Amino acid sequence: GSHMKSILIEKPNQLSIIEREIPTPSAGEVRVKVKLAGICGSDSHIYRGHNKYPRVIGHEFFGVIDAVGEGVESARVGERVAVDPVVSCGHCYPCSIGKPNVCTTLAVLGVHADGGFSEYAVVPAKNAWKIPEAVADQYAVMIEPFTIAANVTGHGQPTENDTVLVYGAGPIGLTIVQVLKGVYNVKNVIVADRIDERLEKAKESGADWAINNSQTPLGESFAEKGIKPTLIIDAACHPSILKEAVTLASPAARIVLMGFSSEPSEVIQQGITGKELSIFSSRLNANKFPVVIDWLSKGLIKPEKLITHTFDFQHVADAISLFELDQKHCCKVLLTF
Amino acid sequence: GSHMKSILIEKPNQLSIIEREIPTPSAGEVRVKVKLAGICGSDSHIYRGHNPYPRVIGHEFFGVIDAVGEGVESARVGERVAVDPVVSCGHCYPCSIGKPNVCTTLAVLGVHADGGFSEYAVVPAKNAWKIPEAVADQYAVMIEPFTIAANVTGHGQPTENDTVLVYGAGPIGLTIVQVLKGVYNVKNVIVADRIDERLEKAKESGADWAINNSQTPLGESFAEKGIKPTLIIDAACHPSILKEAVTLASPAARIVLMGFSSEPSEVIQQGITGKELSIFSSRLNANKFPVVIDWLSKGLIKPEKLITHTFDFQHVADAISLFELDQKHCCKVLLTF
Ligand SMILES: NC(=O)C1=CN([C@@H]2O[C@H](COP(=O)(O)OP(=O)(O)OC[C@H]3O[C@@H](n4cnc5c(N)ncnc54)[C@H](O)[C@@H]3O)[C@@H](O)[C@H]2O)C=CC1
Ligand SMILES: NC(=O)C1=CN([C@@H]2O[C@H](COP(=O)(O)OP(=O)(O)OC[C@H]3O[C@@H](n4cnc5c(N)ncnc54)[C@H](O)[C@@H]3O)[C@@H](O)[C@H]2O)C=CC1
Ligand SMILES: [Mn+2]
Ligand SMILES: [Mn+2]
Ligand SMILES: [Zn+2]
Ligand SMILES: [Zn+2]
């Protein structure tokens, strides 16, 4: 009982399950014995080396505090916790205005520092959020994805009367549909994608209109119904999208970007300022764990709709493969411990 | 006594002082006998045919009500008023959310409909705002330009500790500087411009640091001082500025765009979302006349610092030309009646 297994990305396309000493938490830290972890695009991108090595990945994880560091209440041992991967300094400009997600010395667990694809992880005490007993383990592991939705909608401020367009019906887009419908009671949620199976999944998650734009552009589809969205959320993120969103938008609308493309987006300010559009962006989460846990308590969102597969962590390579290849029928994939 | 002179743009590059019947206000309207009007860029653009007629121009004007239409209190006759050029429908989506400035059927006086470069003009009664006796005629006529500043800062929400960069020390940029300093008590207002004489005017209006970036890019000067603005306002509006603003921005910063360039701006989303920037735009004003009128009562802004020249309205062609030439010694030009 002195060592543990961790999934390590040594370099692009080298993933090993290595054995490590069980870590001790320092002051202000806790150790989590991990139960579940989720697979996200960022895990794939690090594995396939699209961007520091070696790195244990995984920023979506849930488990039980088995030990606490100095200055942490030992009563916390035994708590069921989901971990916010955003590690912030708490004193820089972004931190001072409640934006730890863009902290000047931001570290994301499973990205810039070792994360949750590991039998034990040491994390800041304040980042480990207690999950109510009524909230199932599998829903808890999904908190981090839903905090992305919470952060995005927090910028957009959806109203019940908004006409909302969401580009993309992957995992991310779907959590957003769920928050729009179940938390904000938006009456008209429109979702766009090119894959019919994902559009069906969007409907199942509460979309009012699932529109395929692989052949007919949204402009034609919308012109026909007289639709001009008042809130547009880009959960697809190809850089050409922003320019179309601007055209589609109602005057006075707002747009939320989620994409990190290093490729240029071309826009014409005449089209933006002429409609006095607002363009927000969203990165990670600004302390959204409490509110999402609240939503889970109230049954406002439905993670079971999005979880499609579960692999033991030893099969992580298989899990990631499936996640990469299977656009239909695969949504969110979990690793067990 | 039944006729009056108006300034008509018949077509591109053709300005004529014509004779017209003194108009009669209809229901909900008043006739204003104009005392002062201001010249703006949009007046020049309409004169020069920059939008690929005929129109009486002038959206910045002040005068006295001398007739009222049906439904308007007859007591308004004799009122000193400045006119909000924003004419909105009141029932479309933007109007319903308090954004008449982008009303789906917006008409701007002096742009889409006949304006204030005229001895008399008829306008909606609700658009004519009573000016306190203590506020001078030439201050009152400056209300519309200051409402632009009010609208912009409304989006930006400047705080005292914000590090603000304003691009452009033309008349628009200068109103922004005054509002930042005098209304929001921003401690650090930085202004960039290519012309030294205007940078000097920026200082006179309250700017804390006036930087010429005609030769040295702002990136260099900012790097040297360790400056990363938290609020960036583009009152210069060349389409390339946005991309530069994004690189200069602090993380979590916001940017307010004011430009209507039909040429493309290139931005890279990596740089926007990476810092979770918000990009606002501002057009005209959303009911900011009372706000600015209040600022004037309280002495928070100083319009006299911006007024450089006055011409009788018959010399408008000379006036506009001087406004178009001479960036050095000309700021805001008024027409008298
Ligand atoms: N905090 C943040 O900003 C985060 C951003 N992301 C980003 O969100 C995006 C979505 O993530 P996932 O759902 O996991 O990806 P995904 O690739 O599974 O889903 C994207 C979906 O968008 C669709 N799509 C692509 N172009 C489209 C267009 N022009 N119109 C309509 N649909 C279109 C695709 O068919 C695909 O179904 C990714 O680009 C990712 O980088 C992901 C996590 C956090
Ligand atoms: N509601 C709105 O959105 C309104 C927008 N505008 C726009 O605001 C802009 C400013 O109007 P004015 O003050 O009358 O224009 P102006 O031409 O008098 O002033 C613009 C200033 O920007 C400077 N400039 C240009 N490129 C620059 C760069 N890369 N860096 C730093 N400085 C730069 C110029 O030297 C000039 O002094 C115009 O483009 C106009 O179209 C004007 C009125 C209302
Ligand atoms: Mn995630
Ligand atoms: Mn103006
Ligand atoms: Zn910080
Ligand atoms: Zn309207």
Short mmCIF file of N, CA, C and O in Angstrom, two decimals, chain A residues 229-300:
data_model
loop_
_atom_site.label_atom_id
_atom_site.label_comp_id
_atom_site.label_asym_id
_atom_site.label_seq_id
_atom_site.Cartn_x
_atom_site.Cartn_y
_atom_site.Cartn_z
N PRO A 229 -31.81 34.45 -34.27
CA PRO A 229 -31.43 34.11 -32.89
C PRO A 229 -30.97 35.32 -32.09
O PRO A 229 -30.28 36.19 -32.62
N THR A 230 -31.37 35.36 -30.82
CA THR A 230 -31.02 36.46 -29.92
C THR A 230 -29.81 36.07 -29.06
O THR A 230 -29.16 36.94 -28.47
N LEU A 231 -29.53 34.78 -28.98
CA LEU A 231 -28.33 34.27 -28.30
C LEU A 231 -27.75 33.13 -29.12
O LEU A 231 -28.46 32.18 -29.45
N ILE A 232 -26.48 33.24 -29.46
CA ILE A 232 -25.82 32.23 -30.29
C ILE A 232 -24.57 31.71 -29.58
O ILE A 232 -23.71 32.50 -29.18
N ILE A 233 -24.49 30.39 -29.43
CA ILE A 233 -23.40 29.76 -28.70
C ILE A 233 -22.63 28.83 -29.63
O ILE A 233 -23.20 27.90 -30.20
N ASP A 234 -21.35 29.10 -29.80
CA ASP A 234 -20.54 28.28 -30.69
C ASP A 234 -19.83 27.17 -29.95
O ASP A 234 -18.73 27.38 -29.40
N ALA A 235 -20.48 26.01 -29.92
CA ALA A 235 -19.89 24.80 -29.39
C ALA A 235 -19.40 23.84 -30.49
O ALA A 235 -19.35 22.63 -30.30
N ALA A 236 -19.06 24.40 -31.65
CA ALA A 236 -18.46 23.63 -32.75
C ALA A 236 -17.05 24.16 -32.99
O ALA A 236 -16.11 23.39 -33.08
N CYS A 237 -16.94 25.48 -33.15
CA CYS A 237 -15.67 26.21 -33.01
C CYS A 237 -14.75 26.35 -34.24
O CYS A 237 -13.64 26.87 -34.11
N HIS A 238 -15.20 25.89 -35.41
CA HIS A 238 -14.44 26.15 -36.63
C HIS A 238 -14.44 27.67 -36.76
O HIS A 238 -15.45 28.32 -36.51
N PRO A 239 -13.28 28.25 -37.12
CA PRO A 239 -13.14 29.72 -37.10
C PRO A 239 -14.08 30.46 -38.05
O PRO A 239 -14.29 31.66 -37.87
N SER A 240 -14.67 29.77 -39.03
CA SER A 240 -15.56 30.41 -39.99
C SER A 240 -16.96 30.65 -39.43
O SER A 240 -17.77 31.38 -40.00
N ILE A 241 -17.25 30.03 -38.29
CA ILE A 241 -18.57 30.09 -37.70
C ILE A 241 -18.97 31.49 -37.24
O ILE A 241 -20.07 31.94 -37.53
N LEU A 242 -18.07 32.18 -36.55
CA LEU A 242 -18.34 33.51 -36.01
C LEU A 242 -18.95 34.47 -37.03
O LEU A 242 -19.94 35.15 -36.74
N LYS A 243 -18.37 34.52 -38.22
CA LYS A 243 -18.87 35.36 -39.30
C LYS A 243 -20.32 35.00 -39.71
O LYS A 243 -21.15 35.88 -39.93
N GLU A 244 -20.63 33.72 -39.78
CA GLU A 244 -22.00 33.31 -40.07
C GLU A 244 -22.94 33.70 -38.92
O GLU A 244 -24.02 34.22 -39.14
N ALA A 245 -22.50 33.45 -37.68
CA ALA A 245 -23.31 33.77 -36.51
C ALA A 245 -23.71 35.24 -36.52
O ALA A 245 -24.85 35.60 -36.21
N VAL A 246 -22.76 36.09 -36.91
CA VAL A 246 -23.00 37.52 -36.99
C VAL A 246 -24.12 37.84 -37.98
O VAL A 246 -25.01 38.63 -37.68
N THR A 247 -24.07 37.21 -39.15
CA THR A 247 -25.11 37.38 -40.16
C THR A 247 -26.47 36.90 -39.66
O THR A 247 -27.48 37.58 -39.84
N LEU A 248 -26.49 35.74 -39.01
CA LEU A 248 -27.74 35.15 -38.54
C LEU A 248 -28.39 35.93 -37.41
O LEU A 248 -29.60 35.89 -37.24
N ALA A 249 -27.57 36.63 -36.64
CA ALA A 249 -28.00 37.21 -35.37
C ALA A 249 -29.09 38.28 -35.50
O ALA A 249 -29.07 39.10 -36.42
N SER A 250 -30.02 38.28 -34.57
CA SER A 250 -30.90 39.43 -34.41
C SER A 250 -30.05 40.63 -34.06
O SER A 250 -28.99 40.49 -33.47
N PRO A 251 -30.51 41.83 -34.44
CA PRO A 251 -29.98 43.04 -33.82
C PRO A 251 -30.02 42.89 -32.31
O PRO A 251 -30.96 42.29 -31.78
N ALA A 252 -29.00 43.43 -31.64
CA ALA A 252 -28.91 43.41 -30.17
C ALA A 252 -28.66 42.02 -29.57
O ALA A 252 -28.73 41.86 -28.36
N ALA A 253 -28.34 41.04 -30.42
CA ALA A 253 -28.07 39.69 -29.93
C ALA A 253 -26.69 39.57 -29.25
O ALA A 253 -25.85 40.46 -29.35
N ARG A 254 -26.47 38.47 -28.55
CA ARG A 254 -25.11 38.19 -28.10
C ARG A 254 -24.64 36.80 -28.53
O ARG A 254 -25.45 35.89 -28.77
N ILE A 255 -23.34 36.68 -28.70
CA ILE A 255 -22.70 35.47 -29.18
C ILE A 255 -21.67 35.03 -28.15
O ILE A 255 -20.94 35.87 -27.61
N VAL A 256 -21.62 33.73 -27.86
CA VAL A 256 -20.58 33.20 -26.98
C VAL A 256 -19.68 32.21 -27.73
O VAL A 256 -20.14 31.17 -28.20
N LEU A 257 -18.40 32.55 -27.83
CA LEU A 257 -17.42 31.67 -28.46
C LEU A 257 -16.77 30.72 -27.45
O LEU A 257 -16.49 31.11 -26.32
N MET A 258 -16.49 29.49 -27.89
CA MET A 258 -15.80 28.53 -27.02
C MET A 258 -14.49 28.00 -27.62
O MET A 258 -13.77 27.23 -26.98
N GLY A 259 -14.19 28.43 -28.84
CA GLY A 259 -13.15 27.82 -29.64
C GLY A 259 -11.77 28.40 -29.41
O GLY A 259 -11.63 29.55 -28.98
N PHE A 260 -10.74 27.62 -29.72
CA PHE A 260 -9.36 28.04 -29.49
C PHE A 260 -8.54 28.02 -30.78
O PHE A 260 -7.33 27.89 -30.75
N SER A 261 -9.22 28.16 -31.92
CA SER A 261 -8.53 28.07 -33.20
C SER A 261 -7.37 29.06 -33.32
O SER A 261 -7.52 30.25 -33.02
N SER A 262 -6.22 28.56 -33.77
CA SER A 262 -5.08 29.42 -34.08
C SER A 262 -5.21 29.98 -35.49
O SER A 262 -4.43 30.84 -35.90
N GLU A 263 -6.20 29.50 -36.23
CA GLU A 263 -6.52 30.02 -37.55
C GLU A 263 -7.42 31.26 -37.45
O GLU A 263 -8.26 31.35 -36.56
N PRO A 264 -7.25 32.22 -38.38
CA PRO A 264 -7.99 33.48 -38.33
C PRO A 264 -9.49 33.34 -38.58
O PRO A 264 -9.92 32.60 -39.47
N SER A 265 -10.28 34.06 -37.79
CA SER A 265 -11.67 34.29 -38.10
C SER A 265 -11.77 35.65 -38.76
O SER A 265 -11.28 36.65 -38.23
N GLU A 266 -12.40 35.70 -39.92
CA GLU A 266 -12.62 36.97 -40.60
C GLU A 266 -14.00 37.53 -40.25
O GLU A 266 -15.01 36.84 -40.41
N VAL A 267 -14.05 38.76 -39.76
CA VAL A 267 -15.32 39.42 -39.50
C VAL A 267 -15.35 40.82 -40.09
O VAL A 267 -14.31 41.42 -40.33
N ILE A 268 -16.56 41.32 -40.32
CA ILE A 268 -16.75 42.67 -40.84
C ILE A 268 -17.44 43.45 -39.75
O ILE A 268 -18.56 43.11 -39.38
N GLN A 269 -16.79 44.49 -39.23
CA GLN A 269 -17.35 45.20 -38.07
C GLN A 269 -18.66 45.92 -38.37
O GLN A 269 -19.50 46.09 -37.48
N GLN A 270 -18.83 46.34 -39.62
CA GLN A 270 -20.12 46.85 -40.05
C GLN A 270 -21.26 45.92 -39.64
O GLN A 270 -22.28 46.38 -39.16
N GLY A 271 -21.08 44.62 -39.80
CA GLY A 271 -22.13 43.67 -39.45
C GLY A 271 -22.31 43.49 -37.95
O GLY A 271 -23.36 43.04 -37.48
N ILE A 272 -21.27 43.84 -37.20
CA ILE A 272 -21.29 43.64 -35.76
C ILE A 272 -21.85 44.87 -35.08
O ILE A 272 -22.89 44.84 -34.41
N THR A 273 -21.15 45.98 -35.27
CA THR A 273 -21.54 47.23 -34.66
C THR A 273 -22.91 47.69 -35.17
O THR A 273 -23.71 48.24 -34.40
N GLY A 274 -23.20 47.44 -36.44
CA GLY A 274 -24.51 47.75 -36.99
C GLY A 274 -25.68 47.12 -36.25
O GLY A 274 -26.78 47.69 -36.22
N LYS A 275 -25.45 45.96 -35.65
CA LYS A 275 -26.45 45.25 -34.84
C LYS A 275 -26.19 45.38 -33.33
O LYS A 275 -26.90 44.79 -32.51
N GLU A 276 -25.17 46.16 -32.99
CA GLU A 276 -24.66 46.26 -31.63
C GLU A 276 -24.60 44.87 -30.96
O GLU A 276 -25.12 44.67 -29.87
N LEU A 277 -23.98 43.92 -31.65
CA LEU A 277 -23.79 42.58 -31.11
C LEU A 277 -22.79 42.58 -29.95
O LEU A 277 -21.91 43.44 -29.88
N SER A 278 -22.94 41.62 -29.05
CA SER A 278 -21.94 41.39 -28.01
C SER A 278 -21.31 40.05 -28.29
O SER A 278 -22.01 39.08 -28.54
N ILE A 279 -19.98 39.99 -28.26
CA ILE A 279 -19.32 38.71 -28.46
C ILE A 279 -18.52 38.34 -27.22
O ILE A 279 -17.47 38.92 -26.95
N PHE A 280 -19.04 37.37 -26.48
CA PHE A 280 -18.38 36.85 -25.30
C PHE A 280 -17.53 35.65 -25.67
O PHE A 280 -17.70 35.04 -26.75
N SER A 281 -16.58 35.32 -24.81
CA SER A 281 -15.89 34.04 -24.91
C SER A 281 -15.95 33.33 -23.56
O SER A 281 -16.27 33.94 -22.54
N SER A 282 -15.67 32.04 -23.57
CA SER A 282 -15.83 31.25 -22.37
C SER A 282 -14.67 30.28 -22.32
O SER A 282 -14.41 29.59 -23.30
N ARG A 283 -13.97 30.26 -21.19
CA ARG A 283 -12.86 29.33 -20.99
C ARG A 283 -13.01 28.63 -19.65
O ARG A 283 -13.11 29.31 -18.62
N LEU A 284 -13.02 27.30 -19.67
CA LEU A 284 -13.06 26.51 -18.45
C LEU A 284 -14.25 26.97 -17.59
O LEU A 284 -15.32 27.23 -18.14
N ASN A 285 -14.06 27.10 -16.28
CA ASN A 285 -15.15 27.57 -15.42
C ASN A 285 -14.69 28.55 -14.35
O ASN A 285 -13.63 28.37 -13.74
N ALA A 286 -15.48 29.60 -14.13
CA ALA A 286 -15.20 30.51 -13.03
C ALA A 286 -15.97 30.06 -11.78
O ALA A 286 -17.09 30.52 -11.53
N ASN A 287 -15.35 29.17 -11.01
CA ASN A 287 -15.97 28.58 -9.81
C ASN A 287 -17.43 28.18 -9.99
O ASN A 287 -18.30 28.62 -9.25
N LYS A 288 -17.69 27.33 -10.98
CA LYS A 288 -19.06 26.92 -11.26
C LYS A 288 -19.45 25.62 -10.56
O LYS A 288 -20.57 25.17 -10.69
N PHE A 289 -18.51 25.00 -9.85
CA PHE A 289 -18.82 23.70 -9.23
C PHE A 289 -20.03 23.73 -8.27
O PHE A 289 -20.90 22.86 -8.36
N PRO A 290 -20.10 24.73 -7.37
CA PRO A 290 -21.27 24.82 -6.48
C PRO A 290 -22.60 24.90 -7.22
O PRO A 290 -23.53 24.17 -6.86
N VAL A 291 -22.71 25.76 -8.24
CA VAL A 291 -24.00 25.90 -8.91
C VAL A 291 -24.40 24.62 -9.67
O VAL A 291 -25.56 24.22 -9.67
N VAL A 292 -23.43 23.95 -10.27
CA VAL A 292 -23.75 22.73 -10.98
C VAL A 292 -24.18 21.63 -10.01
O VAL A 292 -25.14 20.90 -10.28
N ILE A 293 -23.50 21.53 -8.88
CA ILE A 293 -23.90 20.59 -7.84
C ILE A 293 -25.33 20.91 -7.40
O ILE A 293 -26.14 20.01 -7.18
N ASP A 294 -25.66 22.20 -7.31
CA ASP A 294 -27.04 22.60 -7.01
C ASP A 294 -28.03 22.08 -8.07
O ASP A 294 -29.10 21.56 -7.73
N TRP A 295 -27.67 22.24 -9.34
CA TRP A 295 -28.51 21.76 -10.45
C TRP A 295 -28.73 20.25 -10.36
O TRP A 295 -29.84 19.75 -10.61
N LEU A 296 -27.67 19.54 -10.03
CA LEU A 296 -27.73 18.09 -9.90
C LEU A 296 -28.68 17.71 -8.77
O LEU A 296 -29.50 16.82 -8.93
N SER A 297 -28.57 18.40 -7.64
CA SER A 297 -29.47 18.19 -6.51
C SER A 297 -30.93 18.36 -6.88
O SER A 297 -31.80 17.71 -6.31
N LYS A 298 -31.20 19.26 -7.81
CA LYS A 298 -32.56 19.62 -8.15
C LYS A 298 -33.07 18.87 -9.37
O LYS A 298 -34.22 19.05 -9.78
N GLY A 299 -32.20 18.05 -9.95
CA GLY A 299 -32.54 17.26 -11.12
C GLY A 299 -32.78 18.11 -12.36
O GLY A 299 -33.56 17.74 -13.23
N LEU A 300 -32.10 19.25 -12.43
CA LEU A 300 -32.30 20.16 -13.55
C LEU A 300 -31.55 19.73 -14.81
O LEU A 300 -31.90 20.13 -15.90
#
